[PDB]
Amino acid sequence: KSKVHYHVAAIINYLGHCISLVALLVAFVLFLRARSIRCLRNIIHANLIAAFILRNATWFVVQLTMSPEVHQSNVGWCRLVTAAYNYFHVTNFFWMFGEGCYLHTAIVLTNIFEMLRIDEGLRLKIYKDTEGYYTIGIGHLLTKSPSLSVAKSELDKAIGRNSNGVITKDEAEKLFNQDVDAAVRGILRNAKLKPVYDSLDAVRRSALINMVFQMGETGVAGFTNSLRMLQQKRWDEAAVNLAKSRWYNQTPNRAKRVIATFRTGTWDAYLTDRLRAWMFICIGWGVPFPIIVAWAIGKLYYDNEKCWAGKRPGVYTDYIYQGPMALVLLINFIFLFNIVRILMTKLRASTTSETIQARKAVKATLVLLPLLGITYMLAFVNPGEDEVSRVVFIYFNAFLESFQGFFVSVFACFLNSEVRS
Numbered sequence: 001k002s003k004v005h006y007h008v009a010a011i012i013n014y015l016g017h018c019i020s021l022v023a024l025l026v027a028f029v030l031f032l033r034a035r036s037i038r039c040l041r042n043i044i045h046a047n048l049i050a051a052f053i054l055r056n057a058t059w060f061v062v063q064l065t066m067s068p069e070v071h072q073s074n075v076g077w078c079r080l081v082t083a084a085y086n087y088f089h090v091t092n093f094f095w096m097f098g099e100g101c102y103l104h105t106a107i108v109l110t111n112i113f114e115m116l117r118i119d120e121g122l123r124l125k126i127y128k129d130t131e132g133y134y135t136i137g138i139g140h141l142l143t144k145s146p147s148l149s150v151a152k153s154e155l156d157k158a159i160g161r162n163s164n165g166v167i168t169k170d171e172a173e174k175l176f177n178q179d180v181d182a183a184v185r186g187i188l189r190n191a192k193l194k195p196v197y198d199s200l201d202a203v204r205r206s207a208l209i210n211m212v213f214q215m216g217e218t219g220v221a222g223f224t225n226s227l228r229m230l231q232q233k234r235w236d237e238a239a240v241n242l243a244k245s246r247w248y249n250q251t252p253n254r255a256k257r258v259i260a261t262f263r264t265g266t267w268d269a270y271l272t273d274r275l276r277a278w279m280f281i282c283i284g285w286g287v288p289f290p291i292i293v294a295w296a297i298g299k300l301y302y303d304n305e306k307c308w309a310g311k312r313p314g315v316y317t318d319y320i321y322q323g324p325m326a327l328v329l330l331i332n333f334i335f336l337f338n339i340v341r342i343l344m345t346k347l348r349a350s351t352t353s354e355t356i357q358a359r360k361a362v363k364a365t366l367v368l369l370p371l372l373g374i375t376y377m378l379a380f381v382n383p384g385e386d387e388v389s390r391v392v393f394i395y396f397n398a399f400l401e402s403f404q405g406f407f408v409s410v411f412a413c414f415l416n417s418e419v420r421s
């Protein structure tokens with residue numbers, strides 16, 4: 001009677017898992033093959049794809065060793081496959097968490113404010129600079145009167161709220177943005193920088209602007225030859241020239257980051273200052289294990305049944321690993337809609353290299369989410385009518401969970417188009 005449903009679905013669920021594995025495996029080969037794999041972006045991709053390969057491969061193992069007879073027998077190796085299968089599931093979320101972390105910071109934590117937040121450094125309390133003048137936020141000069149009580153007045157007037165010598169990180173941003181325009185204003189007046197500035201693009205204007213904040217215009221107007229190459233799009237030559245500057249000799253790190261930003265026209269210099277691979281390898285592969293270890297003990301005491309694949313009401317141990325998965329999915333949601341707030345509001349006007357590639361990423365993450373997300377959503381709720389819908393619910397399920405591999409294979413291969421096009 002019901003086994004009719006089950007033998008039919010088993011074919012659907014079996015067939016797609018084959019397409020999903022060839023698709024995933026092909027993509028995997030493509031990632032390792034290209035020189036694109038030195039970059040952080042694809043390491044996450046390559047590792048994300050690997051995690052799904054291992055999980056999809058275990059689906060066949062689970063199938064070709066799972067009967068009630070085996071189940072009734074808590075066999076040693078039987079509980080291992082269940083533990084492994086569930087382990088890979090935690091991985092999937094945690095490597096997707098990697099994709100999310102990376103994406104988020106790339107869009108949000110990667111701009112001009114952040115760039116100078118690193119280089120110049122941000123202080124939230126009124127202090128004195130090298131010249132004895134009052135400064136607050138990121139190198140923002142308040143007043144040249146040696147009287148602090150006047151600095152607060154100006155700080156308060158500019159901010160609009162009684163500071164008492166302190167502002168938030170939020171406010172320093174506004175002050176910083178107010179300073180950029182002033183910097184941008186001056187450059188354009190100048191006859192030595194403006195032609196060069198007008199030639200550059202967003203990421204490199206930010207680089208020039210950066211140099212402006214460090215040395216002022218008159219200081220940056222000096223090199224002449226360096227800016228000449230930047231004007232003529234001779235990037236590599238410009239980079240070598242800026243190395244020789246005593247600017248570089250005096251402050252090595254800032255130069256590197258600013259100069260490399262000139263050379264590549266990307267924030268890869270700044271973006272990859274905090275984001276490293278080993279961090280992700282610990283999150284993706286190294287954290288799912290203690291999670292499973294705790295879940296094993298829970299299965300030991302409370303529910304030691306059917307190779308831990310059995311479901312015994314009403315003590316639930318599957319929450320030990322599903323919990324973190326749900327938490328991780330939650331954090332990623334906050335990220336996703338954090339990005340959108342930045343996308344729709346403070347980047348609506350902009351159309352740049354990073355932006356085109358920013359919105360095309362969220363589009364993908366918004367397309368993928370239903371496809372993956374539905375199978376988990378449906379789980380919580382049942383028919384119901386128990387009619388045909390029950391068949392649909394059940395028959396819909398196989399197609400979706402089976403073709404995850406294919407979805408993920410193209411999504412990751414989509415991000416190879418997204419990078420530049």
Ligand SMILES: CCC(CC)Nc1cc(C)nc(Oc2c(C)cc(C)cc2C)c1C
Nearest residue numbers: 096097099100328329332335336369372373
């Ligand atoms: C929902 C089920 C789950 C099964 C693997 N899929 C997931 C899991 C997670 C954590 N994030 C996902 O997407 C996002 C979101 C929502 C935000 C960002 C910034 C990045 C990504 C890749 C998907 C599609």
Ligand SMILES: CCCCCCCC/C=C\CCCCCCCC(=O)O
Nearest residue numbers: 273274275276278279281282286287
């Ligand atoms: C499961 C974790 C494996 C532990 C192995 C040891 C790895 C060392 C990891 C972190 C070292 C701590 C300090 C290094 C901070 C540098 C930060 C950075 O460069 O991004």
Ligand SMILES: CCCCCCCC/C=C\CCCCCCCC(=O)O
Nearest residue numbers: 043044046047054084277278281285
């Ligand atoms: C079935 C056994 C479980 C499989 C676990 C595999 C874990 C893989 C561990 C590390 C793979 C490293 C690949 C990342 C590229 C190099 C990153 C780096 O620079 O350190």
